[PDB]
RNA sequence: GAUAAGGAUUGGCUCUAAGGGUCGGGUAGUGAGGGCCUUGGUCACGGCCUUGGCUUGCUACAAUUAACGAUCAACUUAGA
RNA sequence: CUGAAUGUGGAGACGUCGGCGCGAGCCCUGGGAGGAGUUAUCUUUUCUUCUUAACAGCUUAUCACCCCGGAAUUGGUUUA
């Protein structure tokens, strides 16, 4: 995981030339040309991370900030784990092991839960100091939380259907499908991104090029 | 082929089945020759280039290294304005890259131009508007001679061919061509512009860069080898060859170590010049030369050990050492017994 | 006689009903590198042949020794 | 073992498949990107939105014998 | 990786001589590790041991044969 700054003046600068120019020990002409061909789109500013949070053993799928602390960094990876991070010291504090790989993570700090959608077609609820939502038929790729309701969260999955869930329940209360005549259910129909926008509703996007908007207001 | 009769019985090596030989026969061009001392030959070339009237002159050289070396030296002479004419000088030998050869040939074919070429351009190819052909030396084989001077005379055009002879066995080349039904009318050309300086100029231009010295000596040795592989052995004799004259022609100041030089015949410049102070003028190779100089004794000892091991591996070497022992003992005994 | 390379085949041979004893033979010998080593031959005879397993590794030979049945008489050398 | 020799100053013919890989060429004008500047409003030395002055792109003349140079990687005495 | 009557084929099973190639035993011989003899003088000296059976597993072939191809500028080739 990379810990980065919005203000680029606060990071050490990296010089692509310096690797092959300052030592210049045994770099071949082919290597030099290959390195030079990576800077044809002008000389754009380049920066190094503030820190590297490295404890996972498999690729990391999502990382989020704590909705209150802004120092706690819950993340999910493919090594079956949810890891919380101390951003000040840049280390893992606590680790929870799940039975299947995790693909999406969302936080409900107003009722203190973590919803992690896994590759096992279900969303696990964890207490970051229990219940699982089922009904999806493929990888759960993205999650989001309703801004006005405290118990409602949306989930998108690779089966082309978005689903809205109440935390207290265990079954979907509405199942949004992609409204398109040219879309096929299993050929090109996936949801890679879903968003709960407090002013327009539910935004869905994926394998179909269309960006879909659904009301999702009471 | 324009000389298909020469390949007499070798045509059946091709595998002819039902063959029919065809012979087609018809002063278009002039065939001259000059008998001059070799050390003047290049100067004579210059005296032809800046005086004769031509649109294209093709000058033939024996070897490729000679083509490059003399091309560079003539360019240097033209820098000093030794020859003053609207002449553009090109070099084209067959060891170049193919693209360079094509570009040079298409530039020459396309305003008064001189070409320094080996036998690559002698046969087949036709450059229009070629007026003069010079053969700085007669070819290694005489069959190609008719091709080398054959680039001119198309449609009975007024073109001249000139050849140069070494003054020693020149009495044999003309009758040899006459028997082959070729008449060479002797031409007398004055050696203009040489009193004393030309060889001095060549020598002092060689002293500037050791690469020039290397190219000159390499070209001279290559010509000696080329002369070794000569048909009509009686006409072109290695013994009668003017080794000093040829070396003077190339601007050299020392005869390269050859079996020919040792047997059939040193410092041409009477005050000798040492190679230690001779600078290669090229930065990458200067340090290599200095390193080799600092490793003179080590390489000398490597060669000494190689020589000793060759001595021990020769035919019945132990017996040869025994015989040398006996001869040395008897001779050193007689060296005192006769005196006493 | 016969030579075998499979260790479990040797163990299966030593586990048969009609087995008398097994011989363990030690040889000190040189390898192609010149370093001496200890080679263990485990010999047991089946119905009509004598099967020999040659092991040039001390640890593998020790594990095979430990894996022999406790009711099998073992002849050292 | 080819290639004219094998104590010496080794460099050795013409044409004809390949001879380890890779990279590299000027002088001028204007567009781009970086760097040092600087000027206003804005939020408690640091941001946010704005103002004027080493890399590469496009055109115009020389060079096209780069037939040059640079770098990486390989290699040792066949004599009894 | 079934095979009756019936009909065939192979091994058993076959003259003598010549040179060439290959293997084994014997002979010759270098180093080293032991033992014995001679030694007025010389002699790294003289003698002797340094072995691997039937059987079993892996691997190993001249000849012969198969496939492509189509040859005089006649090639290949044996001690013959």
Q: What are phi and psi of A141, to 5 degrees?
A: -95, -40
Q: What are phi and psi of C26, to 5 degrees?
A: -110, 135
Q: How was this structure determined?
A: cryo-EM
Q: How far apart are CA C3 and CA C51, in angstroms?
A: 5
Q: What are phi and psi of B84, to 5 degrees?
A: -115, 105
Q: What are phi and psi of A47, to 5 degrees?
A: -130, 160
Residue of B230, B169, B189, B206 lying closest to B281 (CA atoms): B206
Strand E footprint, Cβ within 7 Å: B 12-13, 15; C 1-3
Q: Which nucleotide is nearest to B16 (CA to C1')?
A: E73
Residues 87-146 of chain A: which lie with beta carbon within 7 Å of strand D?
Answer: none
Q: Which residue is nearest to nucleotide D3 (CA to C1')?
A: B225
Sheet holding B185-186: strands in order across? B87-92, B112-117, B56-60, B132-135, B159-165, B29-35, B185-186
Q: Are A126 and A89 in contact (CB under 8 A)?
A: no
Q: Subunits with at least 3 CB pairs below 8 A relative to chain A?
A: none
Residue A15 (CA) to nucleotide D60 (C1'), in angstroms, measures 35
Residue B83: HSE in the Cβ half-sphere, 13 Å Cα cutoff: 24
Q: Which nucleotides of E are covered by protein (CB under 7 A)?
A: 54-57, 73
Q: Which nucleotide is nearest to B68 (CA to C1')?
A: D67
Q: Which nucleotide is nearest to B221 (CA to C1')?
A: D12
Q: How far apart are CA A121 and CA A132, in angstroms?
A: 10
Q: Give the experimental resolution in Å.
A: 3.1
Residues 103-162 of chain B: which lie with beta carbon within 7 Å of strand D?
Answer: 103-104, 107, 118-120, 140
The torsion of the CA quartet A8, A13, A17, A21, rounded to 10 degrees, works out to 170
| Packed helices B41-49 and B64-79: angle between N→C axes, nearest 10 degrees | 60
CATH number at residue B82: 3.40.50.300
Compute CA C29 distance to the chain's CA centroid, rounded to the nearest angstrom: 17
Which residue precedes each gap in chain B (C to N above 2.5 Å)? 26, 110, 265
Parent domain of B246? 29-265
User: Kindly report the CA angle at A135 between A130 and A138, in degrees rounded to 5?
Assistant: 105
Collect all residues with Cβ–Cβ distance below 8 Å to A153 and sequence separation of at least 6: A106, A108, A115, A143, A144, A145, A146, A164, A165, A167
* Residue position matching structure tokens 């050193």: B332
Residues 198-237 of chain B: which lie with beta carbon within 7 Å of strand D?
Answer: 214, 217-218, 221-222, 224-226, 228-229
Specify the 3-state DSSP secondary structure of B217.
helix
Q: How far apart are CA A38 and CA B164, in angstroms?
A: 62
User: Kindly report the CA angle at B139 between B138 and B140, in degrees rounded to 5?
Assistant: 125
Beta bridge partners of B162: B134
């Amino acid at each position: 995981i990379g810990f980065w700054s919005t203000i680029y003046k606060e990071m050490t600068v990296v010089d692509p030339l310096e690797d092959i120019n300052n030592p210049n020990n045994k770099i071949s002409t082919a290597a030099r040309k290959r390195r030079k061909l990576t800077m044809k789109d002008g000389t754009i500013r380049r920066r190094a991370p503030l820190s590297l949070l490295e404890s996972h053993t498999a690729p990391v799928e999502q990382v989020i900030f704590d909705s209150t602390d802004n120092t706690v960094g819950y993340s999910v990876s493919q090594d079956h784990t949810i890891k919380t991070w101390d951003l000040v010291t840049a280390r893992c504090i606590d680790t929870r092991t799940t039975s299947y790989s995790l693909l999406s993570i969302a936080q409900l700090s107003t009722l203190n839960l973590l919803a992690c959608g896994s590759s096992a077609r279900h969303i696990t609820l964890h207490d970051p100091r229990q219940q699982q939502l089922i009904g999806h038929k493929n990888f759960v790729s993205s999650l989001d939380t309703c801004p006005e309701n405290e118990y409602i969260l949306c989930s998108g999955s690779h089966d082309g259907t978005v689903k809205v869930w109440d935390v207290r329940s265990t079954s979907p209360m509405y199942t949004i499908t992609r409204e398109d005549k040219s879309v096929q259910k299993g050929v090109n129909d996936k949801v890679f991104a879903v968003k709960w926008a407090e002013k327009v509703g539910i935004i869905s996007a994926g394998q179909d090029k269309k960006i879909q908007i659904n009301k999702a207001d009471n | 082929s324009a000389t298909m009769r020469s390949a007499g019985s070798d045509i059946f090596k091709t595998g002819l089945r039902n063959p029919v030989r065809i012979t087609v026969n018809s002063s278009s061009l002039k065939l001259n020759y000059c008998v001059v001392n070799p050390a003047e030959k290049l100067q004579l070339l210059v005296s032809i280039l800046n005086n004769y009237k031509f649109k294209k002159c093709i000058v033939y050289f024996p070897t490729c290294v000679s083509v490059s070396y003399f091309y560079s030296f003539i360019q240097y002479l033209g820098k000093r304005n030794i020859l003053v004419n609207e002449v553009e000088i090109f070099s084209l030998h067959g060891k170049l890259q193919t693209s360079a050869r094509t570009k040079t040939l298409t530039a020459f074919t396309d305003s008064n131009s001189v070409l320094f070429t080996t036998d690559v351009a002698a046969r087949g190819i036709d450059i229009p508007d070629v007026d003069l052909v010079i053969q700085l030396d007669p070819p290694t084989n005489t069959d190609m001679f008719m091709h080398r001077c054959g680039r001119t005379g198309r449609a009975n055009r007024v073109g001249k061919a000139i050849t140069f002879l070494n003054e020693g066995r020149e009495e044999d080349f003309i009758p040899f061509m006459q028997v082959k039904n070729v008449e060479l009318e002797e031409l007398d050309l004055e050696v203009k512009g040489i009193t004393a300086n030309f060889y001095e100029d060549f020598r002092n231009w060689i002293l500037e860069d050791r690469d020039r010295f290397d190219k000159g000596v390499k070209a001279y040795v290559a010509f000696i080898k080329y002369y070794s592989n000569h048909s009509a052995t009686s006409i072109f004799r290695l013994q009668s060859l003017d080794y000093v004259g040829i070396a003077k022609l190339y601007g050299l100041f020392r005869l390269p170590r050859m079996p020919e030089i040792t047997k059939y015949l040193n410092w041409l410049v009477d005050p000798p010049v040492n190679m230690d102070e001779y600078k290669y003028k090229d930065k990458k190779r200067e340090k290599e030369r200095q390193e080799t100089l600092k490793n003179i004794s080590l390489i000398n000892d490597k060669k000494k050990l190689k020589s000793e091991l060759k001595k021990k591996n020769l035919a019945w070497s132990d017996k040869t050492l025994t015989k040398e022992r006996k001869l040395e003992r008897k001779e050193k005994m007689s060296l005192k017994r006769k005196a006493i | 006689a016969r030579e075998i390379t499979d260790i479990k085949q040797f163990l299966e041979l030593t586990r048969r009903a009609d087995v008398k004893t097994a011989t363990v033979k030690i040889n000190k010998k040189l390898n192609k590198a010149g370093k001496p080593f200890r080679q263990t031959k485990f010999k047991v005879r089946g119905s009509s042949s004598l099967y020999t397993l040659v092991i040039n590794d001390a640890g593998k030979a020790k594990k095979l020794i430990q894996s022999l049945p406790p009711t099998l008489k073992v002849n050292r050398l």
